[PDB]
Ligand binder design. Structure first.
Ligand SMILES: C[S@@+](CC[C@H](N)C(=O)[O-])C[C@H]1O[C@@H](n2cnc3c(N)ncnc32)[C@H](O)[C@@H]1O
Ligand SMILES: C[S@@+](CC[C@H](N)C(=O)[O-])C[C@H]1O[C@@H](n2cnc3c(N)ncnc32)[C@H](O)[C@@H]1O
Lengths: 257, 257
């Protein structure tokens, strides 16, 4: 065998997990261990469940809310965490059964409405900025700072921003950042001695999830090795190093307003 | 909704076809319309069949030879081309039933042996140089000019070289160039206004072929749209233009020895 085949040990989901950890780490630095009575998180995809699981140790009650009911499949069936679809959450709110002191909005572009958010009175409000590199259309579609507006000078307000250092990503979306990370890594790996080519093992996940509601297929596909390499040399370690370096190019922080 | 999903009309196979056409055009310019009694082409993947069908108009007999029998699946039922595995071809040689005046070697790295080639006496010999940008391991593994050595100054000898302008590719392989073209295109498409991300729809085709022998799955996978785009705006025309521009970076020519 002169030509070999090497799959990275790092999977697509490992990349998404690492990015999710950086994002929550930014939140943890922002909150500084403050405890809450009731947390509401909007948006399960893609790192809403992780956020809920982590904040649950600092909160008596945690609600994870999504406009799509099928997203419940991503929420395991026991913990301080309660999943609700948006309509269920609105109903309980009207009944005065929820009154969160921490609200986290992860819905991004075309997500939750400022009008709805304005009905609440949290101690702390965090919204994830979906924007990435400068882009006229994306900037126009974004209304992040209209979501923060009702809480300014009334609550502790933070805007979560995630970017790639000296690299281009169009959004701060976990999967988008994952895609760009893996694609970039495949290009750098290609340059390694003896490598013939490197394939980024990505699929169109939002068609699978939001148009077929097939979570298990989604989970199966992201469990694939991030990159498959055709090479004359064992470059596995070097490939893992490139993936790790690209992951660490990702920088997440919370801007306080 | 706000976010759209757009597939390119160009499929993966369309890219490979374009590259195959550029490669053959270089061969056709080299051959200058010379006609032959018997053509032997080594290596069907990925553009051996196309070469065979085109040369069939200029030859009384065309043999397409591969070390792998399952490669026969790439040779359609509606042509004059004759497939032989290497052992069958060798057997015909021993019986004195083959004596090609044109030999085309497309096997690339670790391919056909110079010793075996030296057994023949063609009028014209063409070898595809598998190399791309300089790579110490690939350069060492290549023995293109030891394959030409027995035919120098006795026959018309050409070395087919295929490269990417202002880009790095490690080999001249049709699929390799296809992979690099589509990945590069997806990155450039990503930069367009309103585009959120772009996925290159590539698979690990050599696992499907050499280790599942599933040509139908391969053909099915390459018939997929080259790139899937998540975007706020309809950028289909611009995406096809970018894909076309990247394809046109590929340049093929035959160096006469
Ligand atoms: C586009 S994803 C955002 C991804 C996330 N910001 C990240 O970086 O990984 C939006 C998620 O929030 C949910 N969502 C969208 N609109 C919502 C709304 N109005 N209220 C609650 N959830 C919503 C969607 O179902 C989807 O799961
Ligand atoms: C790596 S591919 C070459 C791809 C081609 N040069 C291109 O650019 O598309 C090699 C092909 O030649 C065949 N092959 C490899 N060794 C061979 C040999 N010794 N004799 C005949 N065919 C061979 C393989 O089955 C495979 O189909």
């Amino acid at each position: 065998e002169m030509v070999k085949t090497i799959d990275t040990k790092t999977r697509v989901v490992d990349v998404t997990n690492e990015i999710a950890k950086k994002k929550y780490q930014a939140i943890r630095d922002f909150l500084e261990g403050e405890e809450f009575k009731e947390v509401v998180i909007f948006g399960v995809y893609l790192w809403g469940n992780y956020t809920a699981q982590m904040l649950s140790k600092y909160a008596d009650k945690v609600y994870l809310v999504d406009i799509h009911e099928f997203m419940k499949g991503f929420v395991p069936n026991n913990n301080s965490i309660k999943f609700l679809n948006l309509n269920e959450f609105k109903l309980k709110f009207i009944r005065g059964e929820v009154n969160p002191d921490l609200i986290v909005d992860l819905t991004g572009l075309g997500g939750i409405e400022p009008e709805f958010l304005a009905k609440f009175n949290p101690k702390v409000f965090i919204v994830e900025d979906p924007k990435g590199v400068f882009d006229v259309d994306i900037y126009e579609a974004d209304n992040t700072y209209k979501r923060t507006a009702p809480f300014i000078e009334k609550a502790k307000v933070g805007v979560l921003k995630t970017y790639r250092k000296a690299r281009v990503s169009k959004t701060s979306g976990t999967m988008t950042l994952t895609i760009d990370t893996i694609v970039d890594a495949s290009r750098e790996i290609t340059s390694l001695d003896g490598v013939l080519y490197a394939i980024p093992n990505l699929r169109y996940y939002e068609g699978i999830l939001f148009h077929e509601n097939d979570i298990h297929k989604f989970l199966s596909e992201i469990s694939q090795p991030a990159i498959t390499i055709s090479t004359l040399n064992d470059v596995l370690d070097e490939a893992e190093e490139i993936l790790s370096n690209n992951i660490n190019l990702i920088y997440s922080f919370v801007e306080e307003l």
